Design a protein around this nucleic acid. Structure first.
Ligand code: MG
Ligand code: MG
Ligand code: MG
Ligand code: MG
Ligand code: MG
Ligand code: MG
Ligand code: MG
Ligand code: MG
Ligand code: MG
Ligand code: MG
Ligand code: MG
Ligand code: MG
Ligand code: MG
Ligand code: MG
Ligand code: MG
Ligand code: MG
Ligand code: MG
Ligand code: MG
Ligand code: MG
Ligand code: MG
Ligand code: MG
Ligand code: MG
Ligand code: MG
Ligand code: MG
Ligand code: MG
Ligand code: MG
Ligand code: MG
Ligand code: MG
Ligand code: MG
Ligand code: MG
Ligand code: MG
Ligand code: MG
Ligand code: MG
Ligand code: MG
Ligand code: MG
Ligand code: MG
Lengths: 155, 73, 119
RNA sequence: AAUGCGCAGAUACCGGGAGGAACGCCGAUGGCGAAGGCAGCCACCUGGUCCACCCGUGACGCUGAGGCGCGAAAGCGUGGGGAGCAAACCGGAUUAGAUACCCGGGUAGUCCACGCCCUAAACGAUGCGCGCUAGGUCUCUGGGUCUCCUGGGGGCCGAAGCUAACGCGUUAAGCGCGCCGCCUGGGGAGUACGGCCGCAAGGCUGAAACUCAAAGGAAUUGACGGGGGCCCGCACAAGCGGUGGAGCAUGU
């Protein structure tokens, strides 16, 4: 990105909830370009959301996502000395992606024998503010800011 | 442009060696105590030379400050 | 335990640390602080953040003697000279004034070589 | 970062005191001086200078080997002084080492008086005097009929012209005359010797053997810089998957 600024790709909306914050999540669940696997994982995960709580999955999903995105992170920088962890804002498009990513990674940490169940339980636990994923969010934000001392590089 | 308020205009037919005159003399000092530059006194090279020699004298009498303290920083 | 209500806060800016004395209206100290007092080891202390809590500490410590408002005197040209002042404003203390007052000689003593530059 | 200082209470803050040193702003595009150099304020003593009047003397002028005086800093002698700063030195760091740069200390010294020393990138790297040869513009300081004219001084641009070029160009490096000083390829060498001077440190004068084919000045085109400015590249950053471990295949 020396030259232009690069636009975010506008991904085709969902087939079941019509939401683009979903195919977003579905792409991140995907691997080796097998999209059908990914959908079958996620929509299944939605069916397990519906079982273990009366709530519509789409409001459960969005709830955990909002609950995961950080308001601060650190980014190494230097002039001399050593790499100074500089605290700074997390510009909305990135909160979006950091949340989606961590969610999936966290999901695949779980002991749950199959995916979907992993995704469901991770999607659920995160709505309740618990469950590692929010670990990252909090342990990011907490670890950032704790370098307040070096926040004088606003940008 | 850089043409705000000057000093030489502000006053009138004043003696430039009257180190005892203060209400006049104190118009040539900084917000602090510093002697004002020609760009702000609007005095000729020679006029300004005489201003110092008196503002200094006036300082020794204790009529003019040597220095001050910047308010509202 | 004195109830001074009003007083003065001297901020002392410096490139290495920032320190803040709070004082009864005759200049006698009530409490103080700095970046070391706040917690910071060498080198952070000078940072603007240090000065923020430094000033806040000092003011919190002075609210104890029931200060309501102070006059600010700042000396030094350090980093976080302003952050100390901002912090005293947002401190709840009423800042009645601010005055720069960094001392300078009318050409007096020979500076240390680190401050000599050239001619 | 440490050394260092600090509970024998430091740092920050207020009041009182002692001292040594240097004078902020005004302040430079400034001024003065033969040069070195000269800046708080007052007084005394004292040197140079510029202008107006066109009053006096009547070629009394210029230059100047020797001589004599002056001469930043450092350095020396005898007393005095000693705040800050600081060779040497003593420590802390850094580093491959670090007899350095950075950090905490610190003696001579830096200040005064008197007496020496006499050097320098003591530089405009441009000896002094006089006459001549377009202008423009900025500035310091006189005088006059005061839109401007006329002197002295400091800058910039430029006529002619000069210069190897860069540049200089009424403040010549132009055109000329007078006088002094100095140069004659590089190294050996500002050495040796001799003299003279100095308390010293050293200074002034100043070679040769031997040795080289160069040493130099200015400019040109490049390349380069841990110089600038502008800008690119999956160059980093942001990402997603790898290699580096395993077994095997293939190349070395
Ligand atoms: Mg100790
Ligand atoms: Mg004790
Ligand atoms: Mg002290
Ligand atoms: Mg005191
Ligand atoms: Mg003393
Ligand atoms: Mg000058
Ligand atoms: Mg001169
Ligand atoms: Mg000079
Ligand atoms: Mg005289
Ligand atoms: Mg006559
Ligand atoms: Mg006659
Ligand atoms: Mg001398
Ligand atoms: Mg000396
Ligand atoms: Mg001596
Ligand atoms: Mg002594
Ligand atoms: Mg020292
Ligand atoms: Mg030292
Ligand atoms: Mg001695
Ligand atoms: Mg002497
Ligand atoms: Mg006039
Ligand atoms: Mg002239
Ligand atoms: Mg020509
Ligand atoms: Mg030419
Ligand atoms: Mg010229
Ligand atoms: Mg001539
Ligand atoms: Mg020539
Ligand atoms: Mg010679
Ligand atoms: Mg030779
Ligand atoms: Mg020879
Ligand atoms: Mg010599
Ligand atoms: Mg000899
Ligand atoms: Mg002898
Ligand atoms: Mg050359
Ligand atoms: Mg280049
Ligand atoms: Mg990368
Ligand atoms: Mg392998």
């Amino acid at each position: 990105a020396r030259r232009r600024r690069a636009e975010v790709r506008q991904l085709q909306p969902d087939l079941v909830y019509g939401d683009v914050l979903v195919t977003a999540f579905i792409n991140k669940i995907m691997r080796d370009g097998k999209k059908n696997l990914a959908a079958r994982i996620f929509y299944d995960a939605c069916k397990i959301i519906q079982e273990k709580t009366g709530q519509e999955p789409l409001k459960v999903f969005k709830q955990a996502v909002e609950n995961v995105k950080p308001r601060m992170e650190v980014r190494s920088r230097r002039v001399g000395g050593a790499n100074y962890q500089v605290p700074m804002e997390v510009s909305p498009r990135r909160q979006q992606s950091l949340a989606l990513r961590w969610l999936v990674q966290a999901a695949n940490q779980r002991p749950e024998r199959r995916a979907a169940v992993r995704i469901a339980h991770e999607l659920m636990d995160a709505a309740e503010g618990k469950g590692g994923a929010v670990k990252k969010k909090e342990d990011v934000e907490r670890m950032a800011e704790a370098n307040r001392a070096y926040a004088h590089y606003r940008w | 442009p850089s043409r705000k308020a000057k000093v030489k205009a502000t006053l009138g037919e004043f003696d430039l060696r009257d180190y005892r005159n203060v209400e006049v003399l104190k118009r040539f000092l900084s917000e602090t105590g510093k002697i004002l530059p020609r760009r702000r006194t609007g005095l000729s090279g020679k006029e300004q030379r005489i201003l110092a020699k008196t503002i200094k004298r006036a300082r020794i009498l204790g009529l003019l400050p040597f220095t001050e303290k910047l308010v509202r920083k | 335990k004195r109830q001074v209500a009003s007083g003065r806060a001297y901020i002392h800016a410096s490139y290495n640390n920032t320190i803040v004395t709070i004082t009864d209206p005759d200049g006698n100290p009530i409490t103080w602080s700095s970046g070391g007092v706040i917690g910071y080891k060498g080198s952070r202390k000078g940072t603007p953040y240090a000065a923020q809590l430094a000033a806040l500490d000092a003011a919190k410590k002075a609210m104890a003697y029931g200060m309501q408002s102070v006059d600010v005197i700042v000396r030094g040209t350090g980093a976080g000279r302003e952050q100390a002042i901002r912090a005293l404003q947002a401190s709840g203390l009423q800042v009645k004034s601010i005055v720069d007052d960094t001392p300078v000689p009318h050409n007096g003593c020979r500076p240390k070589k680190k401050f000599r530059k050239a001619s």
